[PDB]
Amino acid sequence: SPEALLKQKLDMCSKKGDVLEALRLYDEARRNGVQLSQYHYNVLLYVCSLAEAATESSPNPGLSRGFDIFKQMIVDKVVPNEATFTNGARLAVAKDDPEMAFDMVKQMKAFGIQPRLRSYGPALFGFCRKGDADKAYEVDAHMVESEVVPEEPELAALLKVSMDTKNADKVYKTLQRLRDLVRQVSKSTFDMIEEWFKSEVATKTGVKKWDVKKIRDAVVSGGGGWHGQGWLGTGKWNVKRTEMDENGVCKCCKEKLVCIDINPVETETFAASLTRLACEREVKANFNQFQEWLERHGPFDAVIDGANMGLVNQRSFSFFQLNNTVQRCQQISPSKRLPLVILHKSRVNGGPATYPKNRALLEKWKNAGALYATPPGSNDDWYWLYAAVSCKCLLVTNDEMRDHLFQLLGNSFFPRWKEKHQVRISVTREDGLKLNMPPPYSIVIQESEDGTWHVPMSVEDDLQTSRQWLCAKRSK
Ligand SMILES: [Sr+2]
Ligand SMILES: [Zn+2]
């Protein structure tokens, strides 16, 4: 069967990386009238991605024809799927022709296809490296129009190209986008922002006077922690690497950062998403059974990830560390409620239950309405997440929350929720166990009412490493 032959012949052609033979074979199928399928086209895109940019000659048939093949797939109304976009992008990156990468995205749009974020990169990054800001901004506007959300690398590129071309309005706008979508910035981006604020263009932008009432109302309107009305003040910036104290007071300038509210309506949307996601991956009846039990229990001030409390920094499950975490949560509860312990039934009945008094305590917590033993096969994470979200209470876990599951939750709401709800434990020799509570301010880029900026660097563990901030305040 001829399509099936081609499939095999291209699967074969090539794990060998034979582009010249993939291209001969492409042509042959078309001289034979064999209709190329989704799979055929993808293998062909991949294989052309193996080719390379000819520094010493006019470009090679492989990369060159790759775009031709991509163009042709879309003409043929073969639907792209995730591998199509990835291979399409690799091809774009290898060629390193931004204008040509942009064409692909334009063709996609023309034919009612949604480009992905990775489709835009080779275009955006190409123009930014070459210093072409106007093209970068076109790509940016196209991505906005298609509702494709940039991440930090795309914003950082846009920020640098705006700095390189002296465009203070675009720097401002991109800085706002970093605040809104990223919150805390990588070392890269942090250094770039510091350079911005020390730069001639920053020194020379600003206004000596402005409508305070208008800034005031913008702060209300924005949700807090920024205003978005432009650069304020004039003259040289005083730019310092610094730290916030535990109350969110900048140690450089003494400004007290804001604690930015979460709108309860976003919370109810996220709860609904959480239930839907969990019911897609859990056995639906298991998750529903927990939902129904939770409705009949509580109230709760805290939810514990019992597997994480038993295991974090331990060589095996420590009933001591779980139990001491339960007790400490109960002690900080104003009315001394026990926390809700989420734990696998295998643990309730196995590894932390070979000492009879510990088994009896686990059963006591259950009998107190303060323990739910999840069934075998379940991923506990959906359970303690849903419980903390639905009870609107503290969540006690040191889980990094970088598993694939957690990426399904998004990079706007969930990280803001996490900051306000997550309690983590730390242990010292001198003191034993401590609960580290949510900060009383928001760890995010902030712009004050007089135009002072505070920019937080992202870190792996802000209890392990002390978080550096930038303080940018006009010397005036
Ligand atoms: Sr877990
Ligand atoms: Zn400051």
UniProtKB/Swiss-Prot annotation:
GO terms for molecular function: metal ion binding; ribonuclease P activity. It comes from the Eukaryota. Belongs to the PPR family. P subfamily. Its cofactor is Mg(2+); Mn(2+). PPR repeats lie at residues 2-36, 42-80, 81-115, 116-150. The keyword Membrane does not apply. Endonuclease RNase P responsible for the 5' maturation of tRNA precursors. Preferentially cleaves at the unusual cleavage site, but also able to cleave at the classical cleavage site. Also involved in the maturation of mRNAs in mitochondria. It comes from Arabidopsis thaliana (Mouse-ear cress). This is Proteinaceous RNase P 1, chloroplastic/mitochondrial. Mn(2+) 1 binds at D305, D380. The gene is PRORP1. Mn(2+) 2 binds at D381, D399.
